[PDB]
Amino acid sequence: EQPDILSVGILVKERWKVLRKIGGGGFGEIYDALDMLTRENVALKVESAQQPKQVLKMEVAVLKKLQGKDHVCRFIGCGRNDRFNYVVMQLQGRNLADLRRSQSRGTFTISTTLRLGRQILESIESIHSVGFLHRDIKPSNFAMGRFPSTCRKCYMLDFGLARQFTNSCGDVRPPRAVAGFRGTVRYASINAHRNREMGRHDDLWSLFYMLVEFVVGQLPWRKIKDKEQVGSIKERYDHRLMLKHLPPEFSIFLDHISSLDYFTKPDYQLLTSVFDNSIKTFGVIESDPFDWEK
Template identity: 30%
Template sequence: MNQNSKIEPSVPRTPKRNGDEKCEKTGGEKKKDEDKEKAEKKAEEARAQNKKAQEQDMPRFENGGETEIHTAKDSYEIITELGKGSFGAVFSVIRKSDQRPFALKCESVHMKRAMLPYEANVLLALNLLRSPHFVQLVDHGAVENRFLFVVMKCVGKNLWDIRVTQDGRKYTLSTTMKIAEQTLAALRDLHRVGYLHRDIKPPNFAAGREGEDDYHTVYVLDFGLCRRIALKGKDLRTPRKECAFHRDAVREVKLKLRTGEQLKFVLRSGCYTEMNKILVYLDQLVYTSIPDYDFVYKCIRSSSIGMKCNRNDPPDWDANAKEYRGPAYKLGEPYIVKALE
């Protein structure tokens, strides 16, 4: 037999079943796909419109444009743009009455979903606490038919940007523990006025401004995704059946960290015992639980002592300072402030 000749199968092929063949879409499925395409197109158009509105409505202080913003309380000279995002822009300004620097955050009035008024409400609620971990809202206003704005205290670099400038792109253990204490206190205070942050990550925490008394203080930033869960004179909000957040990736990381070797690698052998207590405790909480923040703090302190971290060592971003000047954690703070009861 010729080796190149084709051998025909002796058994006929099994005919394809109906399920193996590509079926044509029904009218309902086609309509569903069309509706999805329309929704995506509409969302894309909305994003383009928002971007255009932001570009048109934001302060134009260059090339002879506006150099000052006025409110009922004061006037602010625009110095430079600090940053720009999908929901607005932030500018460095000087208050004319006393020449103090502040940050001015703007948002177009033509945005489909306004975020800035909500952020302002969160900051106003936090002002009741006088917590050291939140910037003070000092002024607000609007430029008619263009943008809303709030004026806030200036802060320094965020914790992510600070970390990448350190040796080995990481914080020392002493600084890590101080950050843990301060961020715990900050989130506790936010929860005390009835809000959840829902966007916790290093870029949303920042140190104070270099050269000022609060340089060692850690601030919480960006309250655009906050959700109010407790109202004055009312119980907790009813939990939603579904949440729009994509939690699968977070859950996957969480499960990986629960394995002993992974957790020990991340937390170091000396921190493992106390930090594992925190993780085990948090896993026991449910929606209606009131977290025991003091227990978490004591675990952090115990770990710091066990690893011989000096409480007076300055943070890594101010290593030449003589001592640590960050705010101390206060035990026994009430869960909800009196103004909300």
């Protein structure tokens, strides 16, 4: 097998001391580093400068575009050399994929699900608003903050698979006839399965699948390994069945996203009202313990 892209102990740009590898999936590796300028721990993403698919150029572009917005890591630095490309950003805390897996039956309560859901929808509207599609919405791309002031905030952690979908003016770009999907089968919309150009609604489909998995603990295509077979299931599936364990207003959510296509801007305010109305109906308040606190 290959060694780690970076040796633990090295200094990147005479500033970022590599301490430990913390992740390895996607199209590179991520490390906890010490920033010797600010004297703080940071996250350091790296990719080989020779590997066939490099995505950190996209990571930097989107992270920069989103500075000042909610639910995103603070940008700290970036660079390219003959060995590796790197991006430095705020280090966060516990990953939603991990937090869900730690639950008794892999489920969150509707209180935790609704609050996380609404934060995630905020993060999706935000990336759409600067002209990018995420295209890889899944639990492991979100984490809670790691300080008292940030640990009730959910952050969108990665943008590697994003695509710019607009002009500078906000004109939706003509879709390609074929678009080869590189995201996760489990949370992918039918359009990803069909190798169609993904749109804003495909990120909302993936959120819908994440919310259902949070409350039910599994999706109907949990045990199916073949990507096509998953696609077939989704193509025929009656998504109304997934409403059973969601608050009633999610019928509005599902009817709305079902109506959308590549060329149709989502009604984000309608989808936000589904969360806001559900949270009031269930008497949920922001200070209530999340499931991992209690």
